[PDB]
Amino acid sequence: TGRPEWIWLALGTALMGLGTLYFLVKGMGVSDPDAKKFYAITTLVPAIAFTMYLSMLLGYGLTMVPFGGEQNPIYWARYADWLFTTPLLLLDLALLVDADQGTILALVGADGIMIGTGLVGALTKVYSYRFVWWAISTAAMLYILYVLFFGFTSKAESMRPEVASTFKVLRNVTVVLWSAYPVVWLIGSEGAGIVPLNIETLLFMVLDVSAKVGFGLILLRSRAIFG
Numbered sequence: 001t002g003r004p005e006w007i008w009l010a011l012g013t014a015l016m017g018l019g020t021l022y023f024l025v026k027g028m029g030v031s032d033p034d035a036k037k038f039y040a041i042t043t044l045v046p047a048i049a050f051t052m053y054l055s056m057l058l059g060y061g062l063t064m065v066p067f068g069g070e071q072n073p074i075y076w077a078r079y080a081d082w083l084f085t086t087p088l089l090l091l092d093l094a095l096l097v098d099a100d101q102g103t104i105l106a107l108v109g110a111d112g113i114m115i116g117t118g119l120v121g122a123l124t125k126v127y128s129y130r131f132v133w134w135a136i137s138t139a140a141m142l143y144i145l146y147v148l149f150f151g152f153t154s155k156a157e158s159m160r161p162e163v164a165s166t167f168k169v170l171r172n173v174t175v176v177l178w179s180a181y182p183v184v185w186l187i188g189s190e191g192a193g194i195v196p197l198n199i200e201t202l203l204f205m206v207l208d209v210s211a212k213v214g215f216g217l218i219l220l221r222s223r224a225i226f227g
């Protein structure tokens with residue numbers, strides 16, 4: 001089919017793959033128990049992204065949805081990725097600052113709601129109702145971010161300096177990167193249809209690699225993950 005976005009799906013496959021392999025090799029060599037947990041979680045993240053990026057490349061996870069008088073291409077496979085990857089990233093953050101079980105449950109619950117409503121949105125046929133689901137999803141996201149910013153940061157300042165400092169970086173990457181997703185969806189093929197699907201994929205590829213491989217590099221190279 002040779003769809004124009006394929007190139008970025010192919011580069012995302014390769015970046016996710018390499019990052020998975022690198023983290024696996026590095027994880028395999030660690031014996032510290034606490035470090036191992038971070039390695040497992042953090043290797044699985046780009047691994048999942050890899051599979052989803054590869055699938056999309058090979059033309060799975062793509063469906064046509066009718067709205068605004070057109071058949072719009074929607075990659076639902078991203079949601080299958082983010083369903084598991086986003087809460088895993090939150091888990092890494094939560095274990096870093098030793099967050100309470102209840103906070104974790106709430107964050108993972110809110111995250112499910114973000115991704116589930118984002119997907120309903122993406123698949124909705126009434127143009128205006130697409131944006132209602134988008135709004136509910138953005139809300140859930142903002143809850144998350146609030147918690148990371150106000151709750152976790154506060155928790156991190158009881159910890160050793162390298163733990164507080166590593167957390168702040170990861171928190172800052174997370175806030176900046178995550179906050180861009182809803183904007184992309186809004187202006188792109190799922191929303192207003194302004195940014196073309198080729199460029200939108202580029203944007204999501206950049207954000208995904210940054211949010212998983214970038215995040216992962218900073219986390220796993222830090223001294224904070226040793227118990």
Ligand SMILES: *C/C=C(C)/C=C/C=C(C)/C=C/C1=C(C)CCCC1(C)C
Binds near residue numbers: 085086119137181185
């Ligand atoms: C590795 C992938 C990451 C870190 C993906 C993050 C995705 C989000 C923060 C998605 C947020 C969305 C909304 C807030 C509303 C509309 C739909 C979503 C799912 C793109």
Ligand SMILES: CCCCCCC
Binds near residue numbers: 142143
């Ligand atoms: C009301 C949402 C505010 C989010 C702040 C996150 C840094």
Ligand SMILES: CCCCCCC
Binds near residue numbers: 177
């Ligand atoms: C404090 C580190 C800055 C990250 C911002 C761009 C991801």
Ligand SMILES: CCCCCCC
Binds near residue numbers: 138178179180183
């Ligand atoms: C992080 C995005 C907040 C809502 C959309 C603003 C254009």
Ligand SMILES: CCCCCC
Binds near residue numbers: 102105109
């Ligand atoms: C104490 C956390 C409650 C979680 C329900 C979403």
Ligand SMILES: CCCCCC
Binds near residue numbers: 194195196199
């Ligand atoms: C950031 C998107 C700009 C591409 C042209 C609509």
